[PDB]
Amino acid sequence: KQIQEMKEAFSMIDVDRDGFVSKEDIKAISEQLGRAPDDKELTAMLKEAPGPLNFTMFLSIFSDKLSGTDSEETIRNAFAMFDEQETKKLNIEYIKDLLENMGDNFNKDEMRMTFKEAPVEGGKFDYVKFTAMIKG
Amino acid sequence: SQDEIDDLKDVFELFDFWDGRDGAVDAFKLGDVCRCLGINPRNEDVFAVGGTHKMGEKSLPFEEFLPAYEGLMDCEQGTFADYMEAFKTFDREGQGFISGAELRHVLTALGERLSDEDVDEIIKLTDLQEDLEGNVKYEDFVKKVMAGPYP
Amino acid sequence: FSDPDFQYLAVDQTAAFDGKKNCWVPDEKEGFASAEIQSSKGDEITVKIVADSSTRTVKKDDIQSMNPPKFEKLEDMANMTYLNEASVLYNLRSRYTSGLIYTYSGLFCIAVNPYRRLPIYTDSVIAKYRGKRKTEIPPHLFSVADNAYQNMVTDRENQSCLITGESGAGKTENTKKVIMYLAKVEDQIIQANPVLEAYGNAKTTRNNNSSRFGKFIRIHFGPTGKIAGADIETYLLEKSRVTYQQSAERNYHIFYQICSNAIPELNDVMLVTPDSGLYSFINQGCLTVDNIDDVEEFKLCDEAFDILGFTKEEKQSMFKCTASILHMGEMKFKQRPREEQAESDGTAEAEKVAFLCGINAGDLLKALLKPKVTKGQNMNQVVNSVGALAKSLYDRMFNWLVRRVNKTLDTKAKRNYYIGVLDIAGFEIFDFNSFEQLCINYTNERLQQFFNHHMFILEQEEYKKEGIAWEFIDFGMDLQMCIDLIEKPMGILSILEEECMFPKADDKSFQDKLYQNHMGKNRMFTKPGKPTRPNQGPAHFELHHYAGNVPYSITGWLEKNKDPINENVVALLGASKEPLVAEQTISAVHRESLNKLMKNLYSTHPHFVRCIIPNELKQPGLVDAELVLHQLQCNGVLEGIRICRKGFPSRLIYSEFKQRYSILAPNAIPDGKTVSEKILAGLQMDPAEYRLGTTKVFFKAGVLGNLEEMRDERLSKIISMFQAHIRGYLIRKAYKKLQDQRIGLSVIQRNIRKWLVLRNWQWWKLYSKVKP
C-alpha cells in the first residue's frame, strides 16, 4: 500500500505523462501547488538518481531513504520505558529534558523541529500518537 | 587486572552520570556499584570501606573507588552450603519446607533486615510459589537467588 | 552483628586494675564493695573504698578475689576466674543495669526480673535463636528452650525446665515465653493462660498477678518434630482466697472482671451490679490494681473462651457460677434469742444463688440451717458452711475448667516425646503465715532439693556409673531435713493429718502435739523469734526454709485441712438444673500429688531457669544488692557453677553435636565422632575446655554456652550474606533498565533524528505535498 501510493504519486508528478520524471516534471507540479525549488535544487534533486527516472529508480531512492529504521512497537516501548505508571504519556518537562541534555544531546533546533509537531496537551506529551505520526 | 579495572570504569560511569554527571559518585551508591560487578557485599561490609547511609553525605572519584572494590573483594561470600545450613534451622519437619509468612519474617526481621518491598520484589521476580498449605521449598528459592536475574 | 534485634540482648573494658591491690570487701548496703588494699598487719588489712574513698579494716580471710576487667558483663559465669558471691552479684548487676537480664551460670540460666517490657521476645528475635547452640548467640531464654528441643530430638528423650525463683521473680512470665517460643517454631494453647490466670491468680502485696496454683504443662511433639498436643496439671489452688483476702490483696482476677461492664449484655445474665466494692467476698482487701484493666481483661477472657472452643452456654455456665459466689456471701442471717439455731434475714440474695445453680432456694436455706437424721446449726456454723460451700464450688469449677481446656488440647495426634515446664507457686513470707503458706513453701522446698540432687549428688554418681575417675566433693547442700520435718512419717503434716481424724482435737492439742515431737529433736523447728517486719501477726513456731525463716500461726489449721460442706447441700446440687453444677485429707492428697510430680520429673534431662527479684519495691531497673546477693546464696548459684568448671557436667552425643555445631568450621567437613573431632579441632579449641568420649563429647563448664554464641553469630552472618545476595541480585537485575533506558533513549534519539532528516529531503517534501 506504500507502493500503491508511490505509483499514483509518480503519476501526478510525471506531468508530461511520459513515464519519466524530468526537471520540468518536478518544477511543473511543485508550482501547481506550493513554491517550487530553484534550478540548483532541481538539478541535484535528480542527480540523486543514476539514470532516467522510471517508476523504478524512483521507488529505489525512496526505499533507500526509509531504510535503516525500526518498529512502531519497538519505539513505543523505548518510550514506555520511562512511563513507569504505564499511563501512555510522558510529562513534557521530562521528555524535553531527556532528549535535550542526555545521551546524545539534541540541540535547540532539533528540539524545536521536534516539538513543533509533538502532541502535548495538559502537560503530558502522548508518545503513542506521536510514535504513529513519526511512523505509519 | 586491566580488563577488570576497565569494568569498574564502565560501571562507574553509568552511575556517576545518573547522580549528575561530573566524574564523582555518591558514596551512598558505592554498594550498588560493586553489586553490579558481580559481588554482593553486606551493608556492614560497604560502610567499612567508605559507604554512607544517605545521599548528599559525600561524593567520590574513581581514584578513591579502586580500593573500595579492592576491599569488597577480599570479603566473604555465602556458599550454597551456608544458605542451606541456616535455612535448615527453621525447618522442624526437616523436609525442605517453610511457610511464606516465616520466610518473610527471616528476611525482613532477622540479620541485616530487608525492606518489605525488596521482599515482595524478589518473591515475584524468582516467581516463588506456595502450595495449598502455604509452604515453600526453601531449597528452590535459594537456588534462584543464587542463579541470577538472567540464568 | 549490627542486627537491631540485639538492643537489649548483646553486651555493649581496660586499665586501672591491679590484681593484688583490688579486691572484694564485705558491705552492708551493697553486699560487697570494690576495695584497694593499703596495708596488711597480720590479719588486719586496711583497704580503701573506691566509691566514696573512705577507709577501713577487714579480716584477711574476708577479702574476696575480684575478677579482671577481662570478664565484664560476661555471658557465661562459669568462664570467670572467680565465682564467689561478690563476683557473681557484680556480673549480674552489671548486665542488669544495662538491659541484659539473661546470663548463664554454667549449665543453667539466670533471669533477673525487668519490671518493664522488652523488645527481646519478638518474632524477629525468635528467628535468630532458632537451632542456635548456646555459645553461638547471646544468652536468652529462647536458647534454653531451643536447646531442650534439639536434645529431645537428637537424644530422643523427654526434656524439662524447672523455672524457679521467689515470688514476683519471673517464674510465670518466663514459663509463658517458653511455650510461646516452642509454639512459634497453637492458638488455643497460648489462649489457655488468660482463662486459667483469671481463675487462679490474684493481686497480692508481692504480686499484682500472683499465681495461686501450681502448674505443670507438658508439650508433646510428633515424628516430624512439631507440636502434636499438650496437657496441663495444676496443684493446690488457694481455696481460701475465695472468701478471704488479707489487706492490700485481691480475690481472684475474674470476680473483678465480672463487675466492670466490659460486656454490659452479661450484667443481667449474672445478675450483677457492676460494682465490686459491693460484694463482701471480694472487697475485703483491694479493689483496683495498678496496671490491670479489668474491663479489657474481661473482654480478652471472654474472647479466649471462644477460641478455646467453649459453647456459649458452657462459658455462661462458668460466668454464672462464679457470679453466684459473689451472692453466697450476701446472704445475711439472724438468730432468734432462745435456741439460736438460726433464721434468715431475708431471702432476696439467697434465691439469686439457688437460681444460678438451678436448685430450689427453699430446699437450700433449709438444708443449710438444719442439715439432715437432722442436726440444726447455729448462727456461725452457718456463715462458715456458706464459706465452706463457696470455696468447695470454686475448687470444682477450677478443676472442671482445666479438664475442659485439656479436652480442647489432647489432640489424638501421634506423640513421640515432650517438653514439660514447671511453674510452682514460689516462696513467700508475709506479715501472717498459715497453712496455705506452709503448703506453698513445702512445695518450693522440695523443688530446690531436686536441683541439689541432680546438680551435685547426681553429677558424681554418673562419673562412677560410666566408670571414669574422680574424688567426691561435698557442696553441703541438703534440705532432706526441712523436707523431712514436714513430710516424713511423724512430720508436721503427718501429725496434723492424724489430728484431723479426731473430732475432739483443737488448735492447742495440735500445737502441743507438735512441740511434743520436734522441739529439741530437730533443729529446723524453733520457737517463734522476734519481729523482723511491722504488723507481724501471731506466730506459733518457725521453720528455716531454704529462702527464709517463717513464723507460722497454726490457728484454724484443723478445719483448713479437713474441708467440710453440708453433705446435704451436696445432695441438692447433686441433682441441680444447671448442667455444670450437676457435674483422704488435703495434706495426704497433696503430698501424694507432689510426690507423683517429682517422680515424673526425675525421668528427665532438666534445664534450669533461676528467677531473681531485684528489689522489694516492685519498681523496674532498681537493684537491692543485699537481696540479690542473698538469692545468689540460697539458690546455690556459685556451687552450681564450681562443678561446671571443676567437673565437666557436659555432655553431648556426637550425633546431636555435629548437627548443631558443624556450621562453625564447614571448610573442614568432607562419622559423627570424627566430624566433631574436626570442628572442635578447627576452632583451635583448648584440649582443656573439653574431653573425648566414646559416644559423647564433654565440654567444661560455660563452654557450650559460648559455642551457642559463635553458633549464632555465624547464623546471623549467613542470613545477612543471603540478604546481601538478594540485594545484589535485585540491583544487577535492574541494570539494563539503567541499561534499558540507555537503549530505549538511543532508539528515540536516533529514530527522531531520522524522521527529522527525512522531512528535510526535497523528494519527501514534494512527496508529502502530492499526498492528497
From Swiss-Prot, chain A:
Transmembrane segments: none annotated. InterPro entries: EF-hand-dom_pair (IPR011992), EF_Hand_1_Ca_BS (IPR018247), EF_hand_dom (IPR002048), Myosin_RLC (IPR050403). GO terms for cellular component: myosin complex. Ca(2+) binds at D14, D16, D18, D25. The keyword Metal-binding applies. PROSITE patterns: EF_HAND_1, EF_HAND_2. Signal peptide: none annotated. The keyword Calcium applies. SUPFAM superfamilies: EF-hand. One of its GO terms (molecular function) is calcium ion binding. It holds the Pfam family EF-hand_7. In molluscan muscle, calcium regulation is associated with myosin rather than with actin. Muscle myosin contains two types of light chains: the catalytic light chain, essential for ATPase activity, and the regulatory light chain, a calcium-binding protein responsible for Ca(2+) dependent binding and Ca(2+) dependent Mg-ATPase activity. This chain binds calcium. This is Myosin regulatory light chain, striated adductor muscle. It comes from Argopecten irradians (Bay scallop).
Swiss-Prot record, chain B:
In molluscan muscle, calcium regulation is associated with myosin rather than with actin. Muscle myosin contains two types of light chains: the catalytic light chain, essential for ATPase activity, and the regulatory light chain, a calcium-binding protein responsible for Ca(2+) dependent binding and Ca(2+) dependent Mg-ATPase activity. One of its GO terms (cellular component) is muscle myosin complex. It comes from the Eukaryota. Residues 3-40, 78-113 form the EF-hand domain. CDD domains: EFh (cd00051). It comes from Argopecten irradians. This is Myosin essential light chain, striated adductor muscle. One of its GO terms (molecular function) is calcium ion binding. The keyword Transcription regulation does not apply. Keywords: Motor protein, Muscle protein, Myosin, Repeat. InterPro entries: CALM/Myosin/TropC-like, EF-hand-dom_pair, EF_hand_dom.
Swiss-Prot record, chain C:
Keywords: Actin-binding, ATP-binding, Calmodulin-binding, Coiled coil, Cytoplasm, Motor protein, Muscle protein, Myosin, Nucleotide-binding, Thick filament. Residues 715-742 form the IQ domain. Residues 594-616 are annotated as: Actin-binding. It comes from the Eukaryota. Residues 18-68 form the Myosin N-terminal SH3-like domain. One of its GO terms (molecular function) is microfilament motor activity. ATP binds at G165, E166, S167, G168, A169, G170, K171, T172. One of its GO terms (cellular component) is myosin II complex. The keyword Ribosomal protein does not apply. It is found in: Cytoplasm, Myofibril. Transmembrane segments: none annotated. Muscle myosin is a hexameric protein that consists of 2 heavy chain subunits (MHC), 2 alkali light chain subunits (MLC) and 2 regulatory light chain subunits (MLC-2). Muscle contraction. Myosin is a protein that binds to F-actin and has ATPase activity that is activated by F-actin. Belongs to the TRAFAC class myosin-kinesin ATPase superfamily. Myosin family. This is Myosin heavy chain, striated muscle.
